[PDB]
Write an enzyme that holds these catalytic residues in place. Structure first.
Site, PDB file in Angstrom:
ATOM      1  N   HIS A  50       9.073   1.326   3.341  1.00 37.60           N
ATOM      2  CA  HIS A  50      10.179   1.420   4.308  1.00 37.60           C
ATOM      3  C   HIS A  50      11.088   0.220   4.129  1.00 37.60           C
ATOM      4  O   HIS A  50      10.879  -0.604   3.215  1.00 37.60           O
ATOM      5  CB  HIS A  50       9.626   1.496   5.761  1.00 37.60           C
ATOM      6  CG  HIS A  50       8.599   0.458   6.077  1.00 37.60           C
ATOM      7  ND1 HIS A  50       8.888  -0.896   6.102  1.00 37.60           N
ATOM      8  CD2 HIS A  50       7.283   0.576   6.400  1.00 37.60           C
ATOM      9  CE1 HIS A  50       7.777  -1.568   6.395  1.00 37.60           C
ATOM     10  NE2 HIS A  50       6.800  -0.695   6.592  1.00 37.60           N
ATOM     11  N   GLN A 103      12.618   4.961  -4.192  1.00 40.42           N
ATOM     12  CA  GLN A 103      13.149   3.761  -3.506  1.00 40.42           C
ATOM     13  C   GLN A 103      13.168   2.551  -4.420  1.00 40.42           C
ATOM     14  O   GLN A 103      14.108   1.811  -4.415  1.00 40.42           O
ATOM     15  CB  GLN A 103      12.381   3.402  -2.252  1.00 40.42           C
ATOM     16  CG  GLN A 103      12.302   4.552  -1.268  1.00 40.42           C
ATOM     17  CD  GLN A 103      12.187   4.063   0.129  1.00 40.42           C
ATOM     18  OE1 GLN A 103      13.119   3.446   0.659  1.00 40.42           O
ATOM     19  NE2 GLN A 103      11.042   4.325   0.751  1.00 40.42           N
ATOM     20  N   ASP A 114       8.420   6.674  -2.885  1.00 38.51           N
ATOM     21  CA  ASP A 114       8.142   5.268  -3.145  1.00 38.51           C
ATOM     22  C   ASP A 114       8.843   4.780  -4.415  1.00 38.51           C
ATOM     23  O   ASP A 114       9.590   3.817  -4.388  1.00 38.51           O
ATOM     24  CB  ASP A 114       6.644   5.019  -3.254  1.00 38.51           C
ATOM     25  CG  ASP A 114       5.921   4.942  -1.893  1.00 38.51           C
ATOM     26  OD1 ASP A 114       6.536   4.952  -0.821  1.00 38.51           O
ATOM     27  OD2 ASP A 114       4.695   4.843  -1.918  1.00 38.51           O
ATOM     28  N   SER A 160       4.478   1.422   8.236  1.00 38.59           N
ATOM     29  CA  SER A 160       4.223   2.770   7.689  1.00 38.59           C
ATOM     30  C   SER A 160       3.495   3.617   8.737  1.00 38.59           C
ATOM     31  O   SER A 160       3.644   4.830   8.756  1.00 38.59           O
ATOM     32  CB  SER A 160       3.398   2.710   6.385  1.00 38.59           C
ATOM     33  OG  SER A 160       4.038   1.905   5.378  1.00 38.59           O
ATOM     34  N   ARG A 161       2.753   2.965   9.632  1.00 40.45           N
ATOM     35  CA  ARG A 161       1.959   3.678  10.660  1.00 40.45           C
ATOM     36  C   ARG A 161       2.709   4.073  11.932  1.00 40.45           C
ATOM     37  O   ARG A 161       2.125   4.694  12.834  1.00 40.45           O
ATOM     38  CB  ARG A 161       0.662   2.922  10.977  1.00 40.45           C
ATOM     39  CG  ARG A 161      -0.321   2.970   9.758  1.00 40.45           C
ATOM     40  CD  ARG A 161      -1.787   2.632  10.102  1.00 40.45           C
ATOM     41  NE  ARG A 161      -2.095   1.296   9.624  1.00 40.45           N
ATOM     42  CZ  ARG A 161      -3.154   0.955   8.901  1.00 40.45           C
ATOM     43  NH1 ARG A 161      -4.091   1.844   8.575  1.00 40.45           N
ATOM     44  NH2 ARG A 161      -3.283  -0.309   8.532  1.00 40.45           N
ATOM     45  N   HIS A 170       9.647  -3.259   3.344  1.00 40.76           N
ATOM     46  CA  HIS A 170       9.258  -3.490   1.927  1.00 40.76           C
ATOM     47  C   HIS A 170      10.498  -3.790   1.051  1.00 40.76           C
ATOM     48  O   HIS A 170      10.484  -4.689   0.172  1.00 40.76           O
ATOM     49  CB  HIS A 170       8.513  -2.267   1.387  1.00 40.76           C
ATOM     50  CG  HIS A 170       7.228  -1.954   2.104  1.00 40.76           C
ATOM     51  ND1 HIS A 170       7.056  -0.806   2.846  1.00 40.76           N
ATOM     52  CD2 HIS A 170       6.061  -2.633   2.197  1.00 40.76           C
ATOM     53  CE1 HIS A 170       5.818  -0.759   3.317  1.00 40.76           C
ATOM     54  NE2 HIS A 170       5.197  -1.865   2.950  1.00 40.76           N
ATOM     55  N   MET A 218       0.780  -1.180   0.000  1.00 42.51           N
ATOM     56  CA  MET A 218       0.000   0.000   0.000  1.00 42.51           C
ATOM     57  C   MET A 218       0.851   1.288   0.000  1.00 42.51           C
ATOM     58  O   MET A 218       0.396   2.336   0.409  1.00 42.51           O
ATOM     59  CB  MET A 218      -0.906  -0.092   1.200  1.00 42.51           C
ATOM     60  CG  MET A 218      -1.898  -1.224   0.983  1.00 42.51           C
ATOM     61  SD  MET A 218      -3.487  -0.921   1.771  1.00 42.51           S
ATOM     62  CE  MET A 218      -2.936  -0.738   3.460  1.00 42.51           C
TER      63      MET A 218
HETATM   64  C1  LIG Z   1       9.612  -7.799   6.432  1.00 45.72           C
HETATM   65  O1  LIG Z   1       9.646  -6.530   7.040  1.00 45.72           O
HETATM   66  C2  LIG Z   1       8.426  -5.937   7.047  1.00 45.72           C
HETATM   67  C3  LIG Z   1       7.936  -5.421   8.248  1.00 45.72           C
HETATM   68  C4  LIG Z   1       6.688  -4.792   8.244  1.00 45.72           C
HETATM   69  C5  LIG Z   1       5.942  -4.697   7.054  1.00 45.72           C
HETATM   70  C6  LIG Z   1       6.432  -5.209   5.853  1.00 45.72           C
HETATM   71  C7  LIG Z   1       7.678  -5.827   5.857  1.00 45.72           C
HETATM   72  C8  LIG Z   1       5.518  -4.975   4.886  1.00 45.72           C
HETATM   73  C9  LIG Z   1       4.491  -4.342   5.454  1.00 45.72           C
HETATM   74  C10 LIG Z   1       3.194  -3.880   4.689  1.00 45.72           C
HETATM   75  O2  LIG Z   1       2.139  -3.721   5.301  1.00 45.72           O
HETATM   76  O3  LIG Z   1       3.163  -3.621   3.336  1.00 45.72           O
HETATM   77  C11 LIG Z   1       1.989  -2.973   3.006  1.00 45.72           C
HETATM   78  C12 LIG Z   1       0.809  -3.870   2.643  1.00 45.72           C
HETATM   79  C13 LIG Z   1       0.666  -4.413   1.450  1.00 45.72           C
HETATM   80  C14 LIG Z   1      -0.424  -5.161   1.436  1.00 45.72           C
HETATM   81  C15 LIG Z   1      -1.005  -5.907   0.423  1.00 45.72           C
HETATM   82  C16 LIG Z   1      -2.162  -6.610   0.684  1.00 45.72           C
HETATM   83  C17 LIG Z   1      -2.732  -6.547   1.950  1.00 45.72           C
HETATM   84  C18 LIG Z   1      -2.163  -5.783   2.962  1.00 45.72           C
HETATM   85  C19 LIG Z   1      -0.983  -5.097   2.705  1.00 45.72           C
HETATM   86  O4  LIG Z   1      -0.187  -4.283   3.471  1.00 45.72           O
HETATM   87  N1  LIG Z   1       4.767  -4.163   6.762  1.00 45.72           N
HETATM   88  C20 LIG Z   1       3.928  -3.520   7.812  1.00 45.72           C
HETATM   89  C21 LIG Z   1       3.597  -2.019   7.594  1.00 45.72           C
HETATM   90  O5  LIG Z   1       4.136  -1.380   6.658  1.00 45.72           O
HETATM   91  O6  LIG Z   1       2.789  -1.545   8.429  1.00 45.72           O
END
Ligand SMILES: COc1ccc2c(c1)cc(C(=O)OCc1cc3ccccc3o1)n2CC(=O)O
Ligand SMILES: COc1ccc2c(c1)cc(C(=O)OCc1cc3ccccc3o1)n2CC(=O)O
Lengths: 298, 277
Positions: free
Chosen positions: A44, A92, A89, A197-198, A47, A40
């Site tokens: 960071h 990156q 984005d 991201s939050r 991702h 989404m």
């Molecule tokens: C491996 O180290 C990490 C640690 C935390 C991470 C990630 C990687 C990736 C995410 C993340 O949410 O990506 C966004 C997202 C895409 C997506 C697609 C479909 C459904 C829900 C979805 O949410 N996050 C948590 C974050 O950004 O809050």
């Protein structure tokens, strides 16, 4: 035959599902392995670790989708205008050598509103799903769609949102999707906070207290030599020592989120509120006679 | 690990989903177009027509799946017909193979599923869409073939494909009929000779309506009702004129007239193309 412009070695950005579907198909015909990192945006280091995992596969071409799925917002919840940093984005993604960014409109994803949708299994009503009963339907619907458009060989998700990952493995198994779901260990800040991201939502006091989540889980993972009750109570004591942290749940489960045996191997998952911001984290854990190691446990 | 055993120009029968997915991948890469004909067995001239439509696509290999889907609604005789039809693949999975985790992730159809056939049976189409998604994922055909007789079902399948961005062509094949016009169906064997004679009123109402339609929509509907009113023992659940995607019928133009009725314990369906004025 029908391909949009595609510049190899460059970042190519497509909004039209049809365009990324024809590019992905041409790339597949040349024998490249198409990797998908669904996001989404507001990217960071977490991702980037996903992108780097995808990059490591020989013959890989990486597609990163960016789509803030309205069918996972809001009322109630979740209630935030989600961070959007489309420029940074893509810069990156460039720096990482990603060749495809897919950034669809809502109208192209939902030209018929919510008509045919995915009905998740009953895991979706638990934990994150308790107060927000159609959330996972929205995740699994958009993820199925992304998978059909892009048709990757593997798809990459963080382990932080552990319930969502399990449900996506459920989706792929149950609909016979010919894709490998790759879970990648959570990237953390230096004090142990799981990247999200939050996290930028947290005020100073909150950012400081938020360390309690990962500190709890880590304390539990080491307490677990002494059993599940010790592990849980150690985690809850850490959480209770942190001012302004309000615990949603703290729960032991098996790897598929069924019951945890005592003396087995599973996952500890936590969710808590800090002011108005909800945080999740989880860890691999082993309990009791399963937590013995060469050296000290565990 | 080898691509599973495939004998071109013979009938190759796979029961493992993995097997069929492998074989179909292989052929799509050796320059065949893969055609899928999903069936519940008890095969008749209607299914053979789906088979013949698929066969005619140049470079086709035809996959006929046979699966009685518990979530929905005679083995060696069916395979005989397919061999005789020059069908190269039959896919005949077990229930456990299709549902190893029981009912877990499923397809939720849009609101069309709560209407018409979904009034009696409100979870029928969920089972249909779920099995069809699975078969499409297992075989990955270029084209999938369905009879128009179950028109609501066909329209729902097109909704599935569009909504899930599936990259398959959905081909509807015009309904094969008995000499008197009754739409072919498994259920036609149930009928005693009185029910079987009375059953002709459904197709007769629909074609009378198709031709009355030069005089408008009310003429078309009134003609179909008169024909049904002339049949004994035919309990009509609905008779509805809609647009071709089963929304409201426009003022005039192309549409679909659909009927369902009960004769003793047999529920019969039929529908026809209608062009208003
Ligand atoms: C491996 O180290 C990490 C640690 C935390 C991470 C990630 C990687 C990736 C995410 C993340 O949410 O990506 C966004 C997202 C895409 C997506 C697609 C479909 C459904 C829900 C979805 O949410 N996050 C948590 C974050 O950004 O809050
Ligand atoms: C165009 O000429 C005709 C005329 C009548 C026809 C057909 C073709 C086809 C059928 C039929 O039902 O096939 C079985 C089926 C398998 C399946 C699998 C998943 C979902 C729904 C499914 O439905 N029938 C009616 C019948 O035999 O009861």
């Amino acid at each position: 035959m029908a391909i949009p412009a595609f510049h190899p070695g460059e970042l190519n950005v497509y909004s039209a599902p049809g365009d990324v579907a024809d590019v992905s198909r041409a790339l597949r015909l040349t024998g490249r392995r198409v990797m998908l990192v669904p996001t989404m945006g507001a990217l960071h280091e977490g991702h980037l670790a996903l992108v780097r995992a995808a990059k490591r596969v020989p013959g890989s071409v990486v597609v990163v989708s960016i789509f803030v799925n309205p069918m996972q917002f809001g009322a109630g919840g979740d209630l935030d205008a989600y961070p959007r940093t489309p420029d940074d984005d893509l810069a990156q993604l460039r720096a990482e050598g990603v060749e495809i960014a897919f950034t669809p409109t809502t109208a192209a994803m939902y030209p018929d509103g919510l008509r045919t949708t995915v009905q998740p299994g009953p895991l979706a009503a638990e934990l994150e799903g308790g107060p927000r009963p159609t959330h996972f339907a929205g995740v699994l619907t958009v993820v199925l769609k992304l998978l059909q458009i892009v048709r990757p060989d593997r798809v990459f998700f963080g382990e932080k949102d552990y319930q969502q990952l399990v449900l996506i493995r459920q989706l792929v198994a149950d609909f016979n999707l010919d894709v490998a779901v790759v879970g990648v260990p959570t990237v953390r800040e230096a004090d142990g906070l799981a990247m999200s991201s939050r996290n930028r939502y947290l005020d100073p006091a909150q950012r400081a207290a938020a360390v309690a989540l990962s500190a709890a889980l880590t304390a539990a993972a080491h307490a677990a030599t002494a059993g599940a009750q010790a592990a849980l109570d150690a985690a809850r004591a850490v959480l209770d020592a942190a001012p302004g942290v309000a615990v949603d749940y703290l729960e032991l489960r098996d790897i598929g989120l069924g019951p945890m045996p005592l003396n087995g191997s599973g996952r500890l998952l936590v969710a808590a509120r800090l002011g108005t911001t909800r945080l999740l984290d989880n860890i691999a854990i082993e309990i009791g006679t399963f937590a013995g190691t060469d050296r000290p446990d565990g």
